[PDB]
Amino acid sequence: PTIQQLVRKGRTDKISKNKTPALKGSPQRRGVCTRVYTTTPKKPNSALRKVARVRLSSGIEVTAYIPGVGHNLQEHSMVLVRGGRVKDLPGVRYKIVRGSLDTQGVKGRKQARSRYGAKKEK
Amino acid sequence: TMTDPIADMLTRLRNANQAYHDQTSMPHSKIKAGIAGILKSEGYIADYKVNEPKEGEVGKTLTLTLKYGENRERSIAGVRRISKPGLRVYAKSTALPKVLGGLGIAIISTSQGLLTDKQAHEKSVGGEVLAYVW
RNA sequence: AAAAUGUUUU
RNA sequence: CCGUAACUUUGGGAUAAGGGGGACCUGAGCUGUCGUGCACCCGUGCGGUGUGGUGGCGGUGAGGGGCGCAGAGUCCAGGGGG
RNA sequence: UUGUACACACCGCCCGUCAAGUCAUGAAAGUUGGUAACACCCGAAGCCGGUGGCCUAACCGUUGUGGGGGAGCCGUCGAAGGUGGGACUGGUGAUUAGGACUAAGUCGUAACAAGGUAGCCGUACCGGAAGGUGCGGCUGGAUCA
RNA sequence: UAUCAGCUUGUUGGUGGGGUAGUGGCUUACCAAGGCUUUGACGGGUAGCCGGCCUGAGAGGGUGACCGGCCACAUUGGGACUGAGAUACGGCCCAGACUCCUACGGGAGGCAGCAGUGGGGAAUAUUGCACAAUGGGCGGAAGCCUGAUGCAGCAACGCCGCGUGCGGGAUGACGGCCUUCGGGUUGUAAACCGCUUUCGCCUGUGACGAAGCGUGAGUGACGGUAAUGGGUAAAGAAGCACCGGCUAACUACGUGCCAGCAGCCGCGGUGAUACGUAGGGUGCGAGCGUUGUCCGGAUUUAUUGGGCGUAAAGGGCUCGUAGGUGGUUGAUCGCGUCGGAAGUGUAAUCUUGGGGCUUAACCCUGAGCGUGCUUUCGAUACGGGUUGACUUGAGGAAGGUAGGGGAGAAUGGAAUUCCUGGUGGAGCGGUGGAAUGCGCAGAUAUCAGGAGGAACACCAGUGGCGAAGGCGGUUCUCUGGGCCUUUCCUGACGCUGAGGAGCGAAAGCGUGGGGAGCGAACAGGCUUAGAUACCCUGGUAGUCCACGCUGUAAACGGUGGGUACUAGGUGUGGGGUCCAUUCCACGGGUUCCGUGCCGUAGCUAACGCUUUAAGUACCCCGCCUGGGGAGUACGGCCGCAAGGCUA
Ligand SMILES: [Mg+2]
Ligand SMILES: [Mg+2]
Ligand SMILES: [Mg+2]
Ligand SMILES: [Mg+2]
Ligand SMILES: [Mg+2]
Ligand SMILES: [Mg+2]
Ligand SMILES: [Mg+2]
Ligand SMILES: [Mg+2]
Ligand SMILES: [Mg+2]
Ligand SMILES: [Mg+2]
Ligand SMILES: [Mg+2]
Ligand SMILES: [Mg+2]
Ligand SMILES: [Mg+2]
Ligand SMILES: [Mg+2]
Ligand SMILES: [Mg+2]
Ligand SMILES: [Mg+2]
Ligand SMILES: [Mg+2]
Ligand SMILES: [Mg+2]
Ligand SMILES: [Mg+2]
Ligand SMILES: [Mg+2]
Ligand SMILES: [Mg+2]
Ligand SMILES: [Mg+2]
Ligand SMILES: [Mg+2]
Ligand SMILES: [Mg+2]
Ligand SMILES: [Mg+2]
Ligand SMILES: [Mg+2]
Ligand SMILES: [Mg+2]
Ligand SMILES: [Mg+2]
Ligand SMILES: [Mg+2]
Ligand SMILES: [Mg+2]
Ligand SMILES: [Mg+2]
Ligand SMILES: [Mg+2]
Ligand SMILES: [Mg+2]
Ligand SMILES: [Mg+2]
Ligand SMILES: [Mg+2]
Ligand SMILES: [Mg+2]
Ligand SMILES: [Mg+2]
Ligand SMILES: [Mg+2]
Ligand SMILES: [Mg+2]
Ligand SMILES: [Mg+2]
Ligand SMILES: [Mg+2]
Ligand SMILES: [Mg+2]
Ligand SMILES: [Mg+2]
Ligand SMILES: [Mg+2]
Ligand SMILES: [Mg+2]
Ligand SMILES: [Mg+2]
Ligand SMILES: [Mg+2]
Ligand SMILES: [Mg+2]
Ligand SMILES: [Mg+2]
Ligand SMILES: [Mg+2]
Ligand SMILES: [Mg+2]
Ligand SMILES: [Mg+2]
Ligand SMILES: [Mg+2]
Ligand SMILES: [Mg+2]
Ligand SMILES: [Mg+2]
Ligand SMILES: [Mg+2]
Ligand SMILES: [Mg+2]
Ligand SMILES: [Mg+2]
Ligand SMILES: [Mg+2]
Ligand SMILES: [Mg+2]
Ligand SMILES: [Mg+2]
Ligand SMILES: [Mg+2]
């Protein structure tokens, strides 16, 4: 565009889409497990991915993935929910922080323990 | 209609130099004559001449004769217009532009007449950055 | 001269 | 006197709805009209005309004030909206 | 050699209804809130403007008081509240609409080759659905030169 | 933010008065009708602003913690009082909401001061010490007050520094792990030998901050603190992430599209370097990862620094308003622009030179920076203002001139259909093949006469005209634009153009007319698994006319307008002018304006474009920012409706 066109109407940037609206500017949010279940992934994958409908303290209810082999949380279990997308799962944009509040660390972890909330074993 | 006769001079020179023409001609103006003079003094054209009208009998004609070196080699690597009519560019005595790392010359119209950057910097005078001929 | 279709391997 | 919706065929809907003031005493100026009278055009002897008159009558009144439970004080005289 | 949206290579690719599920969203008799004001009614404190018959040590007195002040009272303004009609906006809503994704469901084969009626654009009507047809246009078609 | 277009009536101005520290519609009376706004008023949304902070090559983008400056507020709303000074935090008055006391009559209160509690939250500390230092209030002073401040506690929250050992040690030991059963690897690692003592722990010494303060005596909260001597033992002191690619670092075992992993590409379906564990390794290290957020990479809003023929992107076309922009030249102004000077840009930060903490972080100090602004003095090349010329851009005059440019009216012929009559008789028609259909009530065919509507063969394309959409019988009437020309005239009057307005194929809509042919819908016949189609026979709106409406097209050259420049070659349309023979014209040239094809330089991702640019440049406008959702919803405008526009 001409300089006069830029003067009359300047450049405008893009919108910069948000990824995790339910957190509302917080690194993680507390919630209650309104439902605990399993979901079949999208193709080409195939499994029984463990997820939970959680009512976060922001008043929004979202689906959160439960990582790691092992699971204890059930109905009305208080959880901490952080960001994180599961690619082969449409509509899952949050994960549950293992080792925090009611959810507990994965039992037999010995590598990458901190990411699954497993205390070091003597 | 014609908007920037200086840009017309620059593009005429660029096109003629690219097409390997020995001479180019244009309607004459004082600032065009000054730019041609400093181009000749800096060695980018062989010579220049202002001709009294005898074909159109209307106005003076400025004619630039260019120089090509051994094996038909361009003496002008390019010319660019800086202070456009749409947006004019003025440079201070400290912020004078450098062309081709200093190899080329920026033509600056200062309050003391047309002066190449090197000159201006020596006189510590700025002005309107007309061209970047290199 | 008209004359349709071709699931999910691993 | 202020103000008034959905909708609309742009006319409406509408007095939509919903408000304020009103009478009495006093009253500054403003006006309708006539007026003896001033000068004047006078075609006068015209059954006239334009300036112009302190005043009379009437209309209207800002403001100020009085009294009562109540000032459209009686009779008369839409309820409204979806 | 030409065309192609095919390259799993025409036993290709691919379109839309219908049926099922999931998610987000629109409409909707209504219903439930919120915000910002408006026009009136009433109007505390208070300042200001009046008034003050009541109360008043300094001042002045013709030494019976007066001056000045104060309580009180009235008026304007005035927060809040009341009443009414609008404006904007959030949630929700029987019912309903299309969108996205998922069976490897059903119905045809519309497009891609001249896709077997060349395709597409605007518009119009028609039809379970793709689509069909008319009118004008385009080549992002071609036959025959 | 325009999916907010009108806002304001003490409102804008005037005069007199009042008021105030003070100007002022600040207030009041009177007079006038202003004031603001598409260069965005009014309304909605969000927000304390800045020095700075983060990021970035820079330009920018994000941000407003500590610290420092200004502002605003102190339970919510309002009000004044006192005072030099008041949003009066720890004041007063009233009202509202709250909490508390009450003998029920009435009273009391406001941590967004410091610490602290409840609550909310992913999340943020002690109900500490001292006025010794600096600052403040009052007092003549000693002094008193100071949750300012100086300090300490708490938290890896950040930054910085240090330690967890150092040298030697092959016999390359065991043990794990791997293996080709040879061995390899962990690994100089260990064992073993000799050393050192920072930090921690134990113990001793022990400050500065005070050139203060106090008449003196005396006087340090921090504080037995920092620093430092001695002692102990190599000890009390290493984890976290990762190892398919980007990306530094690989194998075995287990599992078998399961369990699971993932930032993207993807991995897992029996040989998984991608899951889980182990050995080994790599990056970091009192941290390491994950999540959130910001900038970068992203030239992915491109001023620096992008684009629009086919990738997303040229408005359907023109006219034209604001605006942007401006051929040659004289004079002048000195606003832009440029150069000095003065003032200012506090400090801190930041860059940098010195200095101090054992170094560093940090701290002090000098300078720079503070990218500007104001004042003032100069310069006049350019931009602009004022003013005067010039004619080449532009327009006009006169003459020449091409054409389906447009509107109106009359009118010509062929053909179709229908009608009437003659003739004649069995089919006609139609298709891939048929049938529906028509026809002995005489069709088809054939001839004559007539009626009517619509479109104009040949000319006619490789062409002309128009802003585009578009425009073809002939004639007349009315009318627009273009092209050329040497003289002539005006003298930059130019270009573009948001919003706005007009024009805008066909279909469609309204009223009336017309209706031959054609022909959506429709009916029937065929084809077919079906055939709401293709094909056939019928056939209504429509196609036509008048006047409106709609305003969209693959409205395409998918290429906005203007201008200048940059090889040619070769067709063709229009106007001149020149030449020879003519004294026509055939011909050649040449010039100006169109319209094609080929093609160089150049450009492009390629295809291709290439003087009619998609090349080289300047001016202005429109537009693009991944694909869908979607040119859809909501709102608004336009329309009779269909719908269109904005989005
Ligand atoms: Mg009414
Ligand atoms: Mg009424
Ligand atoms: Mg009265
Ligand atoms: Mg009454
Ligand atoms: Mg009556
Ligand atoms: Mg493919
Ligand atoms: Mg809704
Ligand atoms: Mg009142
Ligand atoms: Mg008073
Ligand atoms: Mg008195
Ligand atoms: Mg009162
Ligand atoms: Mg109120
Ligand atoms: Mg519902
Ligand atoms: Mg098909
Ligand atoms: Mg087809
Ligand atoms: Mg049909
Ligand atoms: Mg005054
Ligand atoms: Mg705020
Ligand atoms: Mg800011
Ligand atoms: Mg501060
Ligand atoms: Mg005072
Ligand atoms: Mg106070
Ligand atoms: Mg204070
Ligand atoms: Mg307090
Ligand atoms: Mg506190
Ligand atoms: Mg909590
Ligand atoms: Mg002191
Ligand atoms: Mg003292
Ligand atoms: Mg005290
Ligand atoms: Mg590698
Ligand atoms: Mg395996
Ligand atoms: Mg950028
Ligand atoms: Mg980014
Ligand atoms: Mg781009
Ligand atoms: Mg362009
Ligand atoms: Mg495109
Ligand atoms: Mg166009
Ligand atoms: Mg348009
Ligand atoms: Mg203009
Ligand atoms: Mg100029
Ligand atoms: Mg000059
Ligand atoms: Mg400094
Ligand atoms: Mg040092
Ligand atoms: Mg500074
Ligand atoms: Mg000028
Ligand atoms: Mg003429
Ligand atoms: Mg007509
Ligand atoms: Mg023909
Ligand atoms: Mg042609
Ligand atoms: Mg002249
Ligand atoms: Mg328009
Ligand atoms: Mg039509
Ligand atoms: Mg019609
Ligand atoms: Mg009709
Ligand atoms: Mg038919
Ligand atoms: Mg067209
Ligand atoms: Mg287009
Ligand atoms: Mg344009
Ligand atoms: Mg152009
Ligand atoms: Mg040409
Ligand atoms: Mg291009
Ligand atoms: Mg629409």
Coordinates of C-alpha atoms (C1' of nucleotides) in Angstrom, one line a residue, chain F residues 161-307:
Chain F
rG161 C1' 29.7 -16.8 44.6
rC162 C1' 31.6 -21.5 47.0
rG163 C1' 31.6 -26.7 48.5
rU164 C1' 30.6 -31.8 48.2
rG165 C1' 37.6 -33.3 47.6
rC166 C1' 43.3 -33.1 45.4
rG167 C1' 47.6 -35.9 43.4
rG168 C1' 49.1 -41.0 42.4
rG169 C1' 47.1 -45.6 41.3
rA170 C1' 46.5 -51.5 35.6
rU171 C1' 46.6 -56.0 38.2
rG172 C1' 42.7 -52.4 33.6
rA173 C1' 40.2 -56.5 40.2
rC174 C1' 35.2 -57.9 41.6
rG175 C1' 29.9 -56.8 40.6
rG176 C1' 26.3 -55.1 37.3
rC177 C1' 25.3 -54.6 31.8
rC178 C1' 26.3 -56.3 26.8
rU179 C1' 28.4 -60.0 23.7
rU180 C1' 30.1 -62.5 18.0
rC181 C1' 31.3 -66.1 24.7
rG182 C1' 36.9 -63.9 22.0
rG183 C1' 35.6 -60.1 25.0
rG184 C1' 33.8 -55.1 25.6
rU185 C1' 31.9 -51.5 29.0
rU186 C1' 31.0 -49.0 33.6
rG187 C1' 36.8 -47.4 34.6
rU188 C1' 41.7 -44.5 37.4
rA189 C1' 36.4 -45.4 38.4
rA190 C1' 37.1 -48.6 42.9
rA191 C1' 40.5 -51.0 46.0
rC192 C1' 45.0 -49.1 47.7
rC193 C1' 48.8 -44.8 48.7
rG194 C1' 49.9 -39.8 50.0
rC195 C1' 47.9 -35.2 50.7
rU196 C1' 44.7 -30.4 51.6
rU197 C1' 40.9 -28.2 55.2
rU198 C1' 37.1 -23.5 51.9
rC199 C1' 31.9 -24.5 53.8
rG200 C1' 29.5 -27.4 57.7
rC201 C1' 30.4 -29.0 63.0
rC202 C1' 33.5 -27.7 67.9
rU203 C1' 36.3 -23.7 70.3
rG204 C1' 38.9 -18.8 70.9
rU205 C1' 39.6 -13.6 69.3
rG206 C1' 36.4 -9.9 67.8
rA207 C1' 34.9 -5.2 64.7
rC208 C1' 33.5 -0.9 61.3
rG209 C1' 29.0 1.5 60.7
rA210 C1' 29.7 7.0 65.7
rA211 C1' 34.5 13.0 62.9
rG212 C1' 27.2 10.9 65.6
rC213 C1' 24.8 11.8 70.3
rG214 C1' 25.4 13.4 75.6
rU215 C1' 27.2 19.1 80.3
rG216 C1' 29.0 14.7 81.8
rA217 C1' 29.0 9.7 83.2
rG218 C1' 28.2 7.3 79.3
rU219 C1' 26.2 5.7 74.3
rG220 C1' 25.4 -0.3 68.4
rA221 C1' 19.1 -2.7 67.6
rC222 C1' 21.9 -5.7 64.1
rG223 C1' 25.5 -8.7 67.7
rG224 C1' 29.6 -12.8 70.1
rU225 C1' 27.3 -10.7 63.9
rA226 C1' 31.0 -10.0 60.0
rA227 C1' 36.0 -11.1 59.8
rU228 C1' 39.6 -14.2 61.9
rG229 C1' 43.1 -18.2 65.0
rG230 C1' 42.8 -23.4 66.5
rG231 C1' 40.4 -28.5 66.1
rU232 C1' 37.6 -32.7 63.5
rA233 C1' 37.3 -36.1 59.7
rA234 C1' 37.7 -37.2 52.8
rA235 C1' 34.3 -36.7 56.0
rG236 C1' 28.4 -33.9 57.2
rA237 C1' 27.2 -32.5 51.7
rA238 C1' 23.9 -34.4 44.2
rG239 C1' 20.3 -34.3 42.1
rC240 C1' 17.0 -33.5 37.7
rA241 C1' 15.9 -33.9 32.7
rC242 C1' 17.0 -36.2 28.3
rC243 C1' 19.2 -40.0 24.6
rG244 C1' 13.9 -41.4 16.4
rG245 C1' 14.6 -36.2 13.7
rC246 C1' 14.8 -31.0 14.8
rU247 C1' 18.7 -31.9 19.3
rA248 C1' 24.0 -33.0 22.6
rA249 C1' 23.6 -38.4 23.9
rC250 C1' 21.9 -46.4 22.5
rU251 C1' 21.6 -50.8 23.6
rA252 C1' 19.3 -55.1 26.2
rC253 C1' 15.0 -57.0 28.6
rG254 C1' 9.4 -56.6 29.2
rU255 C1' 5.0 -55.4 26.4
rG256 C1' 2.4 -56.7 21.6
rC257 C1' -2.3 -50.6 18.1
rC258 C1' -2.6 -53.4 24.6
rA259 C1' -0.3 -50.6 28.3
rG260 C1' 1.2 -46.1 26.9
rC261 C1' 4.3 -41.8 24.6
rA262 C1' 4.2 -37.0 21.9
rG263 C1' 6.0 -29.8 21.0
rC264 C1' 5.5 -31.1 15.4
rC265 C1' 6.6 -35.3 12.2
rG266 C1' 4.7 -39.4 14.4
rC267 C1' 5.8 -44.3 17.9
rG268 C1' 3.1 -49.2 19.8
rG269 C1' 0.0 -54.5 15.0
rU270 C1' 6.3 -59.5 17.8
rG271 C1' 13.8 -57.7 16.5
rA272 C1' 10.1 -50.8 19.6
rU273 C1' 17.5 -46.7 19.6
rA274 C1' 10.1 -43.2 20.3
rC275 C1' 6.1 -47.3 25.5
rG276 C1' 8.1 -49.5 30.8
rU277 C1' 12.6 -51.0 33.3
rA278 C1' 18.0 -51.6 33.4
rG279 C1' 23.1 -50.7 31.9
rG280 C1' 25.6 -47.0 29.3
rG281 C1' 25.5 -42.0 27.8
rU282 C1' 24.3 -36.5 27.2
rG283 C1' 22.9 -31.7 28.8
rC284 C1' 22.6 -28.9 33.2
rG285 C1' 23.7 -28.8 38.5
rA286 C1' 21.5 -26.8 44.2
rG287 C1' 19.1 -27.1 41.2
rC288 C1' 16.5 -29.7 37.0
rG289 C1' 12.0 -30.2 34.5
rU290 C1' 6.6 -29.1 33.5
rU291 C1' 2.7 -25.5 33.0
rG292 C1' 1.2 -20.3 32.3
rU293 C1' 2.4 -15.5 30.0
rC294 C1' 5.4 -12.1 26.8
rC295 C1' 9.0 -11.0 22.8
rG296 C1' 12.0 -13.6 19.3
rG297 C1' 12.4 -16.9 15.2
rA298 C1' 7.5 -14.6 12.0
rU299 C1' 9.7 -10.2 6.2
rU300 C1' 3.4 -14.4 9.5
rU301 C1' 0.6 -6.4 9.1
rA302 C1' 6.7 -6.0 5.7
rU303 C1' 8.2 2.5 7.9
rU304 C1' 13.0 -0.1 8.1
rG305 C1' 10.8 -4.9 5.4
rG306 C1' 5.8 -8.2 1.7
rG307 C1' 2.2 -8.5 -1.9

